Ligand binder design. Structure first.
Ligand SMILES: *[C@@H]1O[C@H](CO)[C@@H](O[C@@H]2O[C@H](CO)[C@@H](O)[C@H](O)[C@H]2NC(C)=O)[C@H](O)[C@H]1NC(C)=O
Ligand SMILES: *[C@@H]1O[C@H](CO)[C@@H](O)[C@H](O)[C@H]1NC(C)=O
Ligand SMILES: *[C@@H]1O[C@H](CO)[C@@H](O)[C@H](O)[C@H]1NC(C)=O
Length: 416
């Protein structure tokens, strides 16, 4: 039995802990994963607006909401009561008609099967979801079992009591090994001591080549206009080609740059000069975003986009708590009956860390090169649209066939 042939009866969820959610289209798409994707995207824009709302406009942003949602879905396998309910609400899993928390894990089996098991060497996604617990903790057999089968995640025991530092180092090495070395410190200096009990860790790694590359020879220093009025020198890339596009409400330009493989694409949201990216951020709702993607059409245009490298690390407890996820991080309120410790009073999640890495260049989301481009016998319409991103713009990396937002971000300053 594997994640791709799993049936609900293969993902048994011990009762006494089940959440009954309240009551409230495209062909070849699984209604199950389709509902789950809308729920995950609801958490995605919500978490994003909350984050950007507490940040300074001139700072970049990059996270993997899919990763966060998944890690926490896996963790909730051993949750119960209010803790279980809080997870269902904060992560929007309850916005799915009337599903039980136990069904959500079935929808993830379906979702995760396509994301990591259906592929190509080109556009593979690397999943890193792990719950680190001190050696004194024993995970329920059903808990380990299902976390393995559905999330390919291990509930890994580490000697936090007397070997805190060497464990943190082991955690950092495991992640680094999963991110091909790009992410080497998911766990910041001095965040794991002899008092650490449970640490949730998750990231998603993606490296892909543009289906339509830019040529380094056409890249050149150009001025980028930051939210603070000042401007800086950026490595602006350039090319002309056919891209799905659409100018939407109040002059916001939406552009989709696909990666080799077609399944995964980069979507860029760029407001008009007159409008602030901040305003577009407050207005971007799951439905507005979806409507925009539906308006896109192939088109020949000029594209000016800067190269950029974003590396964002997160300590999730603070924001998640401020969003309604309380019990999980509370020693008195936490109800994780999937985790047990010899006469140990209270079992709770000490903290959860997530790091994301985005590097964009002429080749795509991967290692740079010298690939030049030669285009012969081409004569394009003199009145074709131009897309010049020399001002802050949003960024989405999505798995189109699964309506999943893998990553989301903001380039408010690409300069060096
Ligand atoms: C994992 O949880 C199950 C509960 O679903 C524990 O097993 C139960 O144990 C009680 C009393 O010992 C029985 O009344 C139930 O019938 C058992 N359920 C089943 C079907 O196993 C189990 O002990 C837990 N494992 C750990 C490591 O704590
Ligand atoms: C969880 O909720 C159930 C009822 O839904 C209750 O009986 C139980 O005491 C609560 N706490 C735990 C940890 O089971
Ligand atoms: C993790 O490290 C092992 C070395 O034991 C290596 O073989 C494996 O390829 C690494 N995992 C990934 C994501 O490549």
């Amino acid at each position: 039995v594997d994640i791709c042939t799993a049936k609900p009866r293969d993902i048994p969820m011990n009762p006494m802990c089940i959440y009954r959610s309240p009551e409230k289209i495209p062909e070849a798409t699984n209604r199950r994963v389709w509902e789950l994707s809308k729920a995950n995207s609801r958490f995605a824009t919500t978490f994003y607006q909350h984050l950007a709302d507490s940040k300074n406009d001139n700072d970049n942003i990059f996270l993997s909401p899919l990763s966060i949602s998944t890690a926490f879905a896996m963790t909730k396998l051993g949750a119960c009561n209010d803790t279980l309910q809080q997870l269902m609400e904060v992560f929007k899993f309850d916005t799915i008609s009337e599903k039980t928390s136990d069904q959500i894990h079935f929808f993830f089996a379906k979702l995760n099967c396509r994301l990591y098991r259906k592929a190509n060497k080109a556009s593979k996604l690397v999943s890193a979801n792990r719950l680190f617990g001190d050696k004194s903790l024993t995970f329920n057999e059903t808990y380990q079992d299902i976390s393995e089968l559905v999330y390919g995640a291990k509930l890994q025991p580490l000697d936090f009591k007397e070997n805190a530092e060497q464990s943190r180092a082991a955690i950092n090495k495991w992640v680094s090994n999963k991110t091909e070395g790009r992410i080497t410190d998911v766990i910041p200096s001095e965040a794991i001591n002899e008092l650490t009990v449970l640490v949730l860790v998750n990231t998603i790694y993606f490296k892909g080549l543009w289906k339509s590359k830019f040529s380094p020879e056409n890249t050149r220093k150009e001025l980028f206009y930051k939210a603070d009025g000042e401007s800086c020198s950026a490595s602006m890339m350039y090319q002309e080609g056919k891209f799905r596009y659409r100018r939407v409400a109040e002059g916001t330009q939406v552009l989709e740059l696909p990666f080799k493989g077609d399944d995964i694409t980069m979507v860029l949201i760029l407001p008009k000069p007159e409008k602030s990216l901040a305003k577009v951020e407050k207005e971007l709702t799951p439905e507005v975003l979806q409507e925009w993607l539906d308006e896109l059409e192939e088109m020949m245009l000029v594209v000016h986009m800067p190269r950029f490298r974003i590396e964002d690390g997160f300590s999730l407890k603070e924001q998640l708590q401020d969003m309604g996820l309380v019990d999980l991080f509370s020693p008195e309120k936490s109800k994780l009956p999937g985790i047990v410790a010899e006469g140990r009073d209270d079992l709770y999640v000490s903290d959860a860390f997530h790091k994301a890495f985005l590097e964009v260049n002429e080749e795509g989301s991967a290692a740079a090169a010298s690939t030049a481009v030669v285009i012969a016998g081409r004569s394009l319409n003199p009145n074709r649209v131009t897309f010049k991103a020399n001002r802050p713009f949003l960024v989405f990396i999505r798995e189109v066939p699964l309506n999943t937002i893998i990553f989301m971000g903001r380039v408010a300053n690409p300069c060096v």
